[PDB]
């Protein structure tokens, strides 16, 4: 009987932006919780909030029981906020208080890159000179890295690292292959990358 | 949270029984089990008030058997496991029916055959001279390949100390053969340091991959080494060359 509708299903934010996530539910509830499931799939509780308001650092929430909705407010978003946010409610028509979870809002927070320097580099294995990977790095956070159409070429998604002491962040993705034919000039061909991406000669 | 679960990871062959355990917060009267499959919200399995099982999902069969014999810890047994049972199994407790506190989960992979289980091969790739020249920074890449199941934890160690600054790891492993059942997996991570730090022969860099595999009491009749839980590492020393 009880249904839960979350909106928006997908959210893309630039680091520092605020946003509001919404959970609509179909009938009176006794219990409501908001959770964060990080990219690793770990489920953490943010708020128990069947009614009223709650504050927790950059996150806050409000549930308007009479209008059957809850809002989760994210202030000054950080890259670590990325993941899936779930709302769960029970029914006021059982007494068991099992939770029914929404289908979630998927949040991607894009790092602020001060001065992108998109480039593709070749890196050799520490042990042997035979093996290498191609590293696409220092691209701006809006860049999308595509999978290869070649089944013997493996390309990872992008991730951001933070060199905390230098006040510096950078994005990267890796491509590799078992093929002796494999070239870094060709590796990320399925991706749409900046026209001024640096491809060193040596 | 105060809620414990064991084991954190479990690999099993299809057609067998497996048992997981939850130890809820002391004094909590209510206990819940949920299942969460890849890229989805948790789904309710069963509920106890004290020792009594008072709600169970209709979607699930007799082969799921939960107990809470002393109104404290609970076990969830899945009989006759199938590959579709691969999921995170989450336990939660509440004092008396209000806020639910969740445990850290048991991640179950059900495989077709234990001969599909392999630990990772791990390699470190050393920084590009061109990167060093262009950016004054140096990125090391760790690549863990050929492992199954996907139950791994990667960490970086600089001079014998775990580092978090300057690191990022793929949030999910990729499939090496995505149209193949029980495909093995690959995972990459980057560690970025200053060029000066990499160029120093006194500095040591290690990528560590903890693999969760077969247990001591798992049978193993294959010719190759038993793919038990183990750490596999790769490492490099800095150098000015």
Numbering used by the authors:
A (entry chain A): 2 to 203
B (entry chain B): 3 to 243
Article sentences:
The T cell receptor is a transmembrane protein with an extracellular antigen-binding domain, consisting of an α- and a β-chain, each comprising one variable (TRAV and TRBV) and one constant (TRAC and TRBC) domain. Superantigens are immune stimulatory toxins that bind directly to TCR and MHC as unprocessed proteins, and hence prevent the TCR from recognizing the peptide presented by MHC. Staphylococcal enterotoxin E belongs to group III, which generally has one binding site to TCR, to the TRBV domain, and two distinct binding sites to MHC class II. Here, we present the structures of a T cell receptor, both by itself and in complex with staphylococcal enterotoxin E. The SEE-TCR structure describes the very first interface between a group III superantigen and its TCR.
The variable domains TRAV22 and TRBV7-9 were isolated from two TCRs specific against HLA-A2 in complex either with a telomerase peptide (sequence ILAKFLHWL) or a survivin peptide (sequence ELTLGEFLKL), respectively. The TCR exhibited the conventional TCR fold described previously. Briefly, the TCR is a heterodimeric protein consisting of an α- and a β-chain, each with one membrane-distal variable domain (TRAV and TRBV) and one membrane-proximal constant domain (TRAC and TRBC). All four domains have Ig-like folds, almost exclusively consisting of β-sheets. Differences in the overall structure of the unbound and SEE-bound TCR are small, with RMSD for main chain atoms of 1.3 and 0.91 for TCRα and TCRβ, respectively. Moreover, Glu69b adopts a single conformation in the bound TCR structure instead of a dual, as in the unligated TCR, since one of the conformations clashes with Tyr32s in SEE.
